[PDB]
Amino acid sequence: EIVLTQSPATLSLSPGERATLSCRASQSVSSYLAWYQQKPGQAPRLLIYDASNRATGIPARFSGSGSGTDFTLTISSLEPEDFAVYYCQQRSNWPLTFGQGTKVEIKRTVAAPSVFIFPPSDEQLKSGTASVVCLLNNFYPREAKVQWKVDNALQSGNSQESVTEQDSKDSTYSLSSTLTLSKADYEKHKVYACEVTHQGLSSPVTKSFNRG
Amino acid sequence: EVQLLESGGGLVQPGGSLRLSCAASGFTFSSYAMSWVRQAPGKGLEWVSAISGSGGSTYYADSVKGRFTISRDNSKNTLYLQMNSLRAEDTAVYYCAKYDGIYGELDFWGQGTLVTVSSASTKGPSVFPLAPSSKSTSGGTAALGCLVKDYFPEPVTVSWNSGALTSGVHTFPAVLQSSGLYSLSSVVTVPSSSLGTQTYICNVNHKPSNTKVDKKVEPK
Numbered sequence: 001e002i003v004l005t006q007s008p009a010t011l012s013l014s015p016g017e018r019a020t021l022s023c024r025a026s027q028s029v030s031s032y033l034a035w036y037q038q039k040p041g042q043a044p045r046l047l048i049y050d051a052s053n054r055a056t057g058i059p060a061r062f063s064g065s066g067s068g069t070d071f072t073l074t075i076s077s078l079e080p081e082d083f084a085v086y087y088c089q090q091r092s093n094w095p096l097t098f099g100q101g102t103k104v105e106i107k108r109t110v111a112a113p114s115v116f117i118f119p120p121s122d123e124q125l126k127s128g129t130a131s132v133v134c135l136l137n138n139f140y141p142r143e144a145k146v147q148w149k150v151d152n153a154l155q156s157g158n159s160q161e162s163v164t165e166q167d168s169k170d171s172t173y174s175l176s177s178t179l180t181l182s183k184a185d186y187e188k189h190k191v192y193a194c195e196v197t198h199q200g201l202s203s204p205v206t207k208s209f210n211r212g
Numbered sequence: 213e214v215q216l217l218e219s220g221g222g223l224v225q226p227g228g229s230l231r232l233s234c235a236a237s238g239f240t241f242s243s244y245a246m247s248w249v250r251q252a253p254g255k256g257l258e259w260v261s262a263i264s265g266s267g268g269s270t271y272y273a274d275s276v277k278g279r280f281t282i283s284r285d286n287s288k289n290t291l292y293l294q295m296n297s298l299r300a301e302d303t304a305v306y307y308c309a310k311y312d313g314i315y316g317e318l319d320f321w322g323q324g325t326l327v328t329v330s331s332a333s334t335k336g337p338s339v340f341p342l343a344p345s346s347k348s349t350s351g352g353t354a355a356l357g358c359l360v361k362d363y364f365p366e367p368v369t370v371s372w373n374s375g376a377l378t379s380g381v382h383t384f385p386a387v388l389q390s391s392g393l394y395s396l397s398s399v400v401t402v403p404s405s406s407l408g409t410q411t412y413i414c415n416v417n418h419k420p421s422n423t424k425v426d427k428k429v430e431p432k
Binding site for chain 1: 247256257258259262271273274307312315316317318319320321322323324338340341342343345347348350353355357359361382384385386387389395396397399401432
């Protein structure tokens with residue numbers, strides 16, 4: 001098969017900068033090379049076909065060039081909505097093959113998270129379980145540290161966290177961490193605290209409540 | 213305008229089988245070669261199969277040869293993919309896509325249908341409130357949400373106030389827990405002054421399990 005190698009794996013560039021994405025084929029594919037954009041939760045969308053031809057309704061700021069084994073996708077001015085994975089694809093030969101993709105991230109200014117904590121519901125407690133949720137809202141960059149503490153004891157192993165895909169409008173991330181304990185453990189302790197470390201914060205932010 | 217509408221994806225046993233469907237409209241179906249392409253959770257794109265306009269010619273990736281059969285019914289404008297001998301590694305969103313016979317690209321894609329190959333049981337979520345309080349309020353902005361807990365398979369959908377509320381919403385990617393069950397949360401930030409005056413309801417749907425919940429989230 002024809003292997004298509006994409007570089008870089010990740011491009012982080014400021015809004016408005018020029019983005020240049022590379023795709024290298026193992027063997028000449030001639031001009032039979034296409035480019036796709038995939039946004040979170042969406043099917044891929046054709047940007048470029050026949051190496052340099054723009055699909056219907058595709059913004060002029062997207063362009064492709066190349067023949068044989070070297071190919072480039074260019075975004076003339078990155079827009080916040082341009083957060084996606086970009087894939088190249090050949091059909092010079094069966095089987096049809098794809099690159100492994102380039103993620104283009106939008107590098108915006110630092111934004112501190114807004115921190116929020118949530119107690120478990122009475123309904124869940126009746127079921128024998130207690131989940132506490134901590135939310136870090138609208139921050140940049142993606143790197144953030146959440147520590148859960150129950151009566152000063154750092155909780156490790158009993159939480160799960162999830163991070164949203166980069167926001168298409170404001171270029172921020174959000175993060176949700178769920179600390180899950182038995183009802184019996186939850187009732188035995190008093191202070192429930194979420195401690196957040198992020199570069200946009202001058203020092204760590206703690207949100208806490210007392211079960212009482 | 214072109215549409216490709218997919219169906220038939222869901223949870224199946226390893227060794228089991230499924231048929232995916234793709235209903236095409238807005239263009240002359242028989243004039244075009246078609247393709248199935250798939251995407252595993254957190255991974256890239258993998259071509260699966262392709263069929264000529266008429267159906268007489270078919271092609272397959274080696275990872276699916278002898279198990280999957282692509283076929284079409286031109287009189288119904290429908291594409292099919294029969295999937296037999298399924299494996300955990302066949303777990304993916306499968307896309308239907310139109311093929312450009314001149315230039316070799318897939319010029320139009322359906323939104324996809326999720327196939328989960330697992331021996332784990334279907335289970336509906338429990339929905340718990342993430343209640344607004346002074347501990348989730350910062351200067352005229354309050355956060356509130358819903359914890360959609362302990363379900364299988366994916367996906368669940370979450371709207372707010374039957375879709376009337378979209379600004380400031382963050383519905384998070386589901387996480388697979390050590391129990392083998394997923395959990396997700398959905399949150400929204402609203403004006404603190406609205407907490408006494410506006411109702412906030414998260415509408416959860418887990419179609420795999422026939423579980424619908426509307427959860428009103430009240431101040432704590």
